[PDB]
């Protein structure tokens, strides 16, 4: 399976995905890395890995459709099979999500369905949970509500901040994102006919 990784910043999940997909038994290959923001560190990690990069500045498009369309163009250029959202912080338009239904994965730093949205760690700390975690799911049109592929629980420790909680959660993210990509790339897991996870 040919994989595009979309990023908005540091790219630690990108790097974990790079590492896993270079294992001999990997069913995924990362053929293109796309950032909506230049100068972000994830672009350096891709270039150190020999992976082509493209920056598509969402700020230069009238609307989301033209912007997504620009992304879709690059995906087609690289004959992409699978899209990984790895710290990509833009919401994608309906038609783009539909076109890639069952082919696009996102990592979210909570145990969905808890703490959807952009500040999961803040929400988890304000709520006072002692267990949080992270989720890889298929991207559906309903944000952070697509079908769940893998999750891993992570303890919240007393005194945790966004800084320390997200550091601990990311170690789990770097485990289940590569595992989830391999499940999809190998065809072991698909978005089933009925839209629920299908294990083959
Ligand atoms: N339809 C659909 N699209 C998508 S994209 C994705 C990948 C992860 C979603 C991240 C997210 C959560 C909330 C926001 C948000 O408010 N972002 C602002 C800009 C934020 C900034 O600048 O940092 C915007 O979108 O302008 O971002 C998952 C997903 C999905 O599950 N469904
Ligand atoms: N709503 C999506 C969201 O909160 N994404 C989160 O952004 C970080 C990106 O880190 P990275 O750039 O080092 O992979 C990750 O922690 C991921 O869970
Ligand atoms: Na999708």
From Swiss-Prot:
<feature type="binding site">
    <location>
        <begin position="89"/>
        <end position="92"/>
    </location>
    <ligand>
        <name>(6R)-10-formyltetrahydrofolate</name>
    </ligand>
</feature>
<comment type="similarity">
    <text>In the central section; belongs to the AIR synthase family.</text>
</comment>
<comment type="function">
    <text>Trifunctional enzyme that catalyzes three distinct reactions as part of the 'de novo' inosine monophosphate biosynthetic pathway.</text>
</comment>
<feature type="binding site">
    <location>
        <position position="64"/>
    </location>
    <ligand>
        <name>(6R)-10-formyltetrahydrofolate</name>
    </ligand>
</feature>
<protein>
    <recommendedName>
        <fullName>Trifunctional purine biosynthetic protein adenosine-3</fullName>
    </recommendedName>
</protein>
<comment type="subunit">
    <text>Homodimer.</text>
</comment>
<feature type="region of interest" description="GART domain">
    <location>
        <begin position="3"/>
        <end position="200"/>
    </location>
</feature>
<feature type="binding site">
    <location>
        <position position="106"/>
    </location>
    <ligand>
        <name>(6R)-10-formyltetrahydrofolate</name>
    </ligand>
</feature>
<feature type="binding site">
    <location>
        <begin position="140"/>
        <end position="144"/>
    </location>
    <ligand>
        <name>(6R)-10-formyltetrahydrofolate</name>
    </ligand>
</feature>
<comment type="similarity">
    <text>In the N-terminal section; belongs to the GARS family.</text>
</comment>
<feature type="active site" description="Proton donor">
    <location>
        <position position="108"/>
    </location>
</feature>
<feature type="binding site">
    <location>
        <begin position="11"/>
        <end position="13"/>
    </location>
    <ligand>
        <name>N(1)-(5-phospho-beta-D-ribosyl)glycinamide</name>
    </ligand>
</feature>
<feature type="site" description="Raises pKa of active site His">
    <location>
        <position position="144"/>
    </location>
</feature>
<feature type="binding site">
    <location>
        <begin position="170"/>
        <end position="173"/>
    </location>
    <ligand>
        <name>N(1)-(5-phospho-beta-D-ribosyl)glycinamide</name>
    </ligand>
</feature>
């Amino acid at each position: 399976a040919r994989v595009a990784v979309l990023i908005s910043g540091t790219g630690s999940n990108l790097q974990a995905l790079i590492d896993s997909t270079r294992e001999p038994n990997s069913s995924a290959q990362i053929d293109i890395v796309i950032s909506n923001k230049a100068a972000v560190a994830g672009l350096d990690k891709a270039e150190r890995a020999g992976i082509p990069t493209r920056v598509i500045n969402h700020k230069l498009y009238k609307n989301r459709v033209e912007f997504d369309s620009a992304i879709d163009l690059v995906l087609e250029e690289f004959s992409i099979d699978i899209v990984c959202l790895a710290g990509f912080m833009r919401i994608l338009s309906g038609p783009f999500v539909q076109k890639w239904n069952g082919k696009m994965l996102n990592i979210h730093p909570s145990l969905l369905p808890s703490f959807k949205g952009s500040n999961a760690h803040e929400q988890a700390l304000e709520t006072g949970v002692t267990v949080t975690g992270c989720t890889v799911h298929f991207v559906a049109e309903d944000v952070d509500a697509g079908q769940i592929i893998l999750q891993e629980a992570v303890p919240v420790k007393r005194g945790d901040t966004v800084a320390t909680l997200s550091e601990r959660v990311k170690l789990a993210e770097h485990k289940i994102f590569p595992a989830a990509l391999q499940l999809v790339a190998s065809g072991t897991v698909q978005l089933g006919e009925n839209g629920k996870i299908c294990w083959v």
